[PDB]
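Q: What does the assembled structure look like for these inputs?
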Amino acid sequence: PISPIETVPVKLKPGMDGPKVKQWPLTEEKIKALVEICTEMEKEGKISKIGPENPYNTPVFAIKKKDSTKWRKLVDFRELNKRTQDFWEVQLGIPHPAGLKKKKSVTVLDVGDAYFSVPLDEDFRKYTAFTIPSINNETPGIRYQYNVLPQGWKGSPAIFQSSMTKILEPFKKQNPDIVIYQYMDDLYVGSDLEIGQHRTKIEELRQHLLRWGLTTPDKKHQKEPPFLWMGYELHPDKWTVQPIVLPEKDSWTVNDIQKLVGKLNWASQIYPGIKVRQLSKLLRGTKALTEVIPLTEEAELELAENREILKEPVHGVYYDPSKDLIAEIQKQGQGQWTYQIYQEPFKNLKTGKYARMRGAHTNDVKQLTEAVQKITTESIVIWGKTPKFKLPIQKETWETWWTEYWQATWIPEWEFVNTPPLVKLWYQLEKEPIVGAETFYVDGAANRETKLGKAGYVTNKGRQKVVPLTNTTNQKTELQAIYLALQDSGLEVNIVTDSQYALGIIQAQPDKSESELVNQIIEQLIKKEKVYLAWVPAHKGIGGNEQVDKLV
Amino acid sequence: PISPIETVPVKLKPGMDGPKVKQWPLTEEKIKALVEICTEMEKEGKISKIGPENPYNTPVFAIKKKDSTKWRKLVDFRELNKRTQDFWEVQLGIPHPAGLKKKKSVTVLDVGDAYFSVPLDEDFRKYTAFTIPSINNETPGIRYQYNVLPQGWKGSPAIFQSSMTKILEPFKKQNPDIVIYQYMDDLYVGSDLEIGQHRTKIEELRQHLLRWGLTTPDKKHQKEPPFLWMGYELHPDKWTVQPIVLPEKDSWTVNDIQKLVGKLNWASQIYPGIKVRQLSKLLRGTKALTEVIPLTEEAELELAENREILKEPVHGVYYDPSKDLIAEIQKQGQGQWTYQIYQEPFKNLKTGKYARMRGAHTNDVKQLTEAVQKITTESIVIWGKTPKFKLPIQKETWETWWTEYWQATWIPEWEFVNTPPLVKLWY
Ligand SMILES: Cc1cc(C)c(Nc2ccnc(Nc3ccc(C#N)cc3)n2)c(C)c1
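A:
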């Protein structure tokens, strides 16, 4: 029940001292249960009767179940943990099954009991002190102290997981085949022996552990494969997500919308193609909760498709370090991009999605990259290497861009996969003014107060125009003036703006943006043959822009 | 090894607790590397394995040192530093010789090996702790902490001074004109004698060190030269300004004069004495763009007036050692990048340009990394302290590869800026 394990020295935060909380009620019956518990506990050495020598008490209690036959002591160390040093965290991040190597047979051993087997640093027992009242009042009650690891102390998961890891070591060496992984109260073992031998070894594992006071059972309660873990369904040869449920409701509220979206991303790791742009576009309102939201048209259509998807079970395969890691990405449409990672052409290893939520003006090629990148980061964590990519873009395209783009990128190994859709530049602005082309001296201001303004142009050829605009911003007109020149210009045009805003946007070479304004513009740019944009200092400067702002 | 000393007390800045930084995921190879390295360090007795009672943590990486065959461990002590050495740039500050930059040539030699002998104050160790990750985080990371002055941590050098200036004094004697500056793990030695003599005074020094114990694991080459005649040798007296100039042209078009009026108007934030009006007034019309046009009254007087004030360095620009250094870097294209190191907008302290060879062998990233590490050293050599880079790269990307071509012993401070429009043009 307790081991000759060396203890981890602990301490209490810098200036702090032991918890001196108390509580002294007395349900005669409970006090018996606890005193009944305490004995079997001190008798087993897990605690020990201590007497007034400054002990710092803590709350005691008793709880009971429905399929009960017993009771349960449940101390509350809340005010103890708030005084203990910090420990090496345990769950940096959870391993992802998409990167788990296949095995023959597995096995999990219940090791919850365990932490009452691992020793507590002598000098820190004096704090685990609690007192259970007797009946009425000549004795404060019976007084104990913890000798192993309290059930709710801060540094217990820690000090356990550590201790365990050291104990496994001999076993782990004398058996490199066997993979051991411990989670919370579980200790999963996985190897390549046929069940028979597997269990030989397992029992050895058990015996080993047993010599160290950490006991375990051979036929307690729960079930085996599938193994329900972290919301995963694990099998000795495949793995899949927790069966999910897309609730059907007559009225949906933020809370339900969230919990709805949440499940969908989670199903995304293996289910191919799940979209989510529409359903979240809604939640874009950040502070309601019981504020019912009208599932719009789009969201609706979307949800359904994920149903069509989900209706079908999909499972994933494991990682063979013997083969390559291939990554293929396809654009779904409105900033939506999907991908599946495999070594084998049929069953996948993992899948996911990437939607440029960031900002509101990005190009199709840039996005392909943000994606390739999102995945590279992913693989490194899961498999420790970069996959080989298969993507819908042709070198000419790509190389062109990374050469034109002001930021540095680094696209690794990649093969072209000719399959619609296709990433490509729909247009390119000219780098030199076009000789002959009419020159439009564009401009357009707006009233920050009245939201009224105008957008015009005045050409070299003497041609003018001024359109009045209601309910807009300067950026909006500074963009409508350009869209104006484009509509009235010919196939080859020269445009001058005193707006770095409109300038840069157009320049980014946006495949799209829902800003219907920029769209009409982007589309004109597509309908043109040759376009040249030109910037110029707004006020101190040219007279053409001013000539349109005196107008404005 | 034998206990060559009796440690020195290191206390973090008050109100400061050790570092708890996250370990970046690593490549399967890089792990094996560290794993190997660390097992030796452990036998040698440099580092020790730690328990759960050590909550702290600092980042680590595996890089290729000067391209050799074996990997080198590079710990990212950037946080422990802020927290310690800032108040150790005080108690034990190492002074920066304002003339090293004037020297004819500067060679740099890795003396990091030195520290691996001076035992570290035991009550400080916990802080140096680092953790080697496991792929797919399946296995609990391995955890170690330093028992000796670790490289990378700016307090290691600051404690070694005593021990260093001793090893050197009987060489700085018979070589009173070469200046030796020690910045962390490197030694910058500068002289004004034909490279042939320098390169010797160097090997002259390199051995002094080696005979007094310090190994200078820098056996660069011999006399069997596959084109790699490289040894770190900088030339600071040639570190001159690159006044970007306006273009001189016979035929000036509307378009052209336009951009020109632009660059100038942007220029005026660094030089307020610039004017355009008369040149610009030659644009007030709404003429075509391809059209060539004529000078004006003092337009030519201005293209020359400014062209002057713009070829002279701006005053009021001084080096505040109370502030930090900010280096901005912009991609110019075709292996060419430009940079600005300052402390306040437009008051540039120094500006250069970098450039790598033609296509088929280099990508941007590798370049940036290089441009960076380059700029940094310049800075160390001129001001004795590394700057903070405003990098024009996607964060994540950078994070993924910056180590792939990172050859330096130290790591600067950086961040990422998606923005520069005119700047590219102006420079
Ligand atoms: C929970 C769980 C159990 C184990 C043994 C591991 N570790 C490893 C290490 C290497 N390969 C595998 N494959 C594997 C794990 C569980 C199952 C099942 N069922 C099948 C294969 N698991 C992890 C990360 C989680």
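Chain A touches chain B through 68 residues (CB under 8 Å).
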